[PDB]
Structures are given as C-alpha cells and as structure tokens.
Design a protein around this motif. Structure first.
Motif, PDB file in Angstrom:
ATOM      1  N   UNK A 157       0.127  -0.667  -4.759  1.00 22.01           N
ATOM      2  CA  UNK A 157       0.761  -1.455  -5.823  1.00 22.01           C
ATOM      3  C   UNK A 157       0.567  -2.951  -5.589  1.00 22.01           C
ATOM      4  N   UNK A 158       0.350  -3.334  -4.335  1.00 21.22           N
ATOM      5  CA  UNK A 158       0.132  -4.730  -4.030  1.00 21.22           C
ATOM      6  C   UNK A 158      -1.352  -5.142  -4.001  1.00 21.22           C
ATOM      7  N   UNK A 159      -2.249  -4.267  -4.471  1.00 21.27           N
ATOM      8  CA  UNK A 159      -3.676  -4.567  -4.516  1.00 21.27           C
ATOM      9  C   UNK A 159      -4.488  -4.481  -3.217  1.00 21.27           C
ATOM     10  N   UNK A 160      -4.037  -3.668  -2.262  1.00 16.55           N
ATOM     11  CA  UNK A 160      -4.734  -3.517  -0.975  1.00 16.55           C
ATOM     12  C   UNK A 160      -5.867  -2.489  -0.942  1.00 16.55           C
ATOM     13  N   UNK A 161      -5.829  -1.555  -1.878  1.00 16.03           N
ATOM     14  CA  UNK A 161      -6.825  -0.505  -1.959  1.00 16.03           C
ATOM     15  C   UNK A 161      -8.248  -1.045  -2.196  1.00 16.03           C
ATOM     16  N   UNK A 162      -9.042  -1.179  -1.127  1.00 10.70           N
ATOM     17  CA  UNK A 162     -10.408  -1.670  -1.259  1.00 10.70           C
ATOM     18  C   UNK A 162     -10.513  -3.181  -1.247  1.00 10.70           C
ATOM     19  N   UNK A 163      -9.403  -3.854  -0.958  1.00 15.07           N
ATOM     20  CA  UNK A 163      -9.406  -5.304  -0.918  1.00 15.07           C
ATOM     21  C   UNK A 163     -10.434  -5.733   0.125  1.00 15.07           C
ATOM     22  N   UNK A 164     -11.419  -6.520  -0.309  1.00 16.95           N
ATOM     23  CA  UNK A 164     -12.509  -6.987   0.558  1.00 16.95           C
ATOM     24  C   UNK A 164     -13.225  -5.821   1.292  1.00 16.95           C
ATOM     25  N   UNK A 165     -13.384  -4.698   0.588  1.00 13.87           N
ATOM     26  CA  UNK A 165     -14.038  -3.532   1.162  1.00 13.87           C
ATOM     27  C   UNK A 165     -13.192  -2.686   2.107  1.00 13.87           C
ATOM     28  N   UNK A 166     -11.904  -3.001   2.242  1.00 14.08           N
ATOM     29  CA  UNK A 166     -11.036  -2.251   3.159  1.00 14.08           C
ATOM     30  C   UNK A 166     -10.210  -1.175   2.430  1.00 14.08           C
ATOM     31  N   UNK A 167     -10.515   0.085   2.719  1.00 10.78           N
ATOM     32  CA  UNK A 167      -9.807   1.205   2.115  1.00 10.78           C
ATOM     33  C   UNK A 167      -8.335   1.173   2.517  1.00 10.78           C
ATOM     34  N   UNK A 168      -7.524   1.852   1.712  1.00 10.57           N
ATOM     35  CA  UNK A 168      -6.088   1.949   1.921  1.00 10.57           C
ATOM     36  C   UNK A 168      -5.801   2.631   3.256  1.00 10.57           C
ATOM     37  N   UNK A 169      -6.618   3.633   3.592  1.00 17.43           N
ATOM     38  CA  UNK A 169      -6.499   4.372   4.847  1.00 17.43           C
ATOM     39  C   UNK A 169      -6.594   3.421   6.055  1.00 17.43           C
ATOM     40  N   UNK A 170      -7.482   2.438   5.972  1.00 17.84           N
ATOM     41  CA  UNK A 170      -7.654   1.458   7.049  1.00 17.84           C
ATOM     42  C   UNK A 170      -6.444   0.539   7.201  1.00 17.84           C
ATOM     43  N   UNK A 171      -5.817   0.182   6.076  1.00 16.58           N
ATOM     44  CA  UNK A 171      -4.624  -0.676   6.106  1.00 16.58           C
ATOM     45  C   UNK A 171      -3.457   0.093   6.689  1.00 16.58           C
ATOM     46  N   UNK A 172      -3.390   1.382   6.369  1.00 17.91           N
ATOM     47  CA  UNK A 172      -2.339   2.244   6.878  1.00 17.91           C
ATOM     48  C   UNK A 172      -2.503   2.396   8.394  1.00 17.91           C
ATOM     49  N   UNK A 173      -3.743   2.631   8.833  1.00 20.92           N
ATOM     50  CA  UNK A 173      -4.033   2.796  10.254  1.00 20.92           C
ATOM     51  C   UNK A 173      -3.628   1.531  11.010  1.00 20.92           C
ATOM     52  N   UNK A 174      -3.935   0.380  10.425  1.00 18.47           N
ATOM     53  CA  UNK A 174      -3.589  -0.903  11.044  1.00 18.47           C
ATOM     54  C   UNK A 174      -2.069  -1.061  11.174  1.00 18.47           C
ATOM     55  N   UNK A 175      -1.346  -0.819  10.078  1.00 14.51           N
ATOM     56  CA  UNK A 175       0.107  -0.952  10.080  1.00 14.51           C
ATOM     57  C   UNK A 175       0.772   0.016  11.057  1.00 14.51           C
ATOM     58  N   UNK A 176       0.228   1.223  11.160  1.00 20.08           N
ATOM     59  CA  UNK A 176       0.756   2.226  12.083  1.00 20.08           C
ATOM     60  C   UNK A 176       0.648   1.752  13.543  1.00 20.08           C
ATOM     61  N   UNK A 177      -0.548   1.334  13.928  1.00 21.92           N
ATOM     62  CA  UNK A 177      -0.779   0.897  15.289  1.00 21.92           C
ATOM     63  C   UNK A 177      -0.211  -0.459  15.674  1.00 21.92           C
ATOM     64  N   UNK A 178       0.053  -1.294  14.685  1.00 24.02           N
ATOM     65  CA  UNK A 178       0.616  -2.613  14.947  1.00 24.02           C
ATOM     66  C   UNK A 178       2.146  -2.618  15.077  1.00 24.02           C
ATOM     67  N   UNK A 179       2.829  -1.926  14.169  1.00 24.15           N
ATOM     68  CA  UNK A 179       4.288  -1.935  14.144  1.00 24.15           C
ATOM     69  C   UNK A 179       4.938  -0.578  13.900  1.00 24.15           C
ATOM     70  N   UNK A 180       4.138   0.460  13.673  1.00 23.84           N
ATOM     71  CA  UNK A 180       4.700   1.764  13.390  1.00 23.84           C
ATOM     72  C   UNK A 180       5.394   1.725  12.039  1.00 23.84           C
ATOM     73  N   UNK A 181       4.877   0.896  11.124  1.00 22.46           N
ATOM     74  CA  UNK A 181       5.413   0.719   9.761  1.00 22.46           C
ATOM     75  C   UNK A 181       6.786   0.003   9.744  1.00 22.46           C
TER      76      UNK A 181
END
Length: 130
Positions: A14-38
């Motif tokens: 909803x915030x426009x992250x899906x594919x932002x600058x070629x980065x899939x939503x899955x990659x943003x989720x993986x990042x958030x998980x490993x950085x702060x556990x959401x």
C-alpha cells in the motif's frame, strides 16, 4: 508495534514498495524480518561510531536521519530519527526508499546480503494477497 507477516506485506504494498527500484516485496519483507523482526521500536547503539540504528528497517543515524547526538552525521532522509520509531511506518518507508536510491540499492543493508541475497525469499509473501 510488532507487525504480523502478511499484515506488513500489505502495509508495504500500500505504501508503494512492491518493485520499488527493482526490489520485490519479498526482499523488503526479508530485510524487515532480519533487521527488527517486524518491530517498529527496535533500536541498536553502535558504541564505536556513536551512531544508532532505528526502527523496522534499522536505519542508521550517521547518514539517514537526525538524532542530534551522532558526531559529524548527515540527514539524507531529512527526518528526525524519532520519525523512524512510529507505529505508522510511512515515514520509515519513505526513508528506506531514499536509501535504496543510493549506489548500492537493497545491498545497502549488510543483513540483506547475509540473509536475503541469493536466497529463496518467497516464503515472506506467501498467502498475503500481494
């Protein structure tokens, strides 16, 4: 605030992250998980360079936000680091977009390189309706 997996996946889309600058939503989720556990209130102090990582994406005060206590720091997201600790992650997403606009892209975060790069990240968006 601690986000639930799919709840966050849709929050990011909803915030426009899906594919932002070629980065899939899955990659943003993986990042958030490993950085702060959401978790939006997560912080980490780096005693060595006197900087602090803030929020869900653990964005660093030396280059991205201003907390007034990091020696010789800049504020490329032009936000107080406090903005990166809110329950509403709009500001944090705007800044994460600013980070990936830099030369490294998603690679800016070492955790992504360690736990997400060259790995299967499909699991993070499975069944989230994104």
């Amino acid at each position: 605030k601690g986000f639930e997996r799919c709840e966050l996946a849709r929050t990011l889309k909803r915030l426009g992250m899906d594919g932002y600058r070629g980065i899939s939503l899955a990659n943003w989720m993986c990042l958030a998980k490993w950085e702060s556990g959401y978790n939006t209130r997560a912080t980490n102090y780096n005693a060595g360079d006197r900087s602090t990582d803030y929020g869900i994406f653990q964005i660093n005060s030396r280059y991205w936000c201003n907390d007034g206590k990091t020696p010789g720091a800049v504020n490329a997201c032009h936000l107080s680091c406090s903005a990166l600790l809110q329950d509403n992650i709009a500001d944090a997403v705007a800044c994460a977009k600013r980070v990936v606009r830099d030369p490294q892209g998603i690679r800016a975060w070492v955790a992504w390189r360690n736990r997400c790069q060259n790995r299967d990240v499909r699991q993070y968006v499975q069944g989230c309706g994104v």
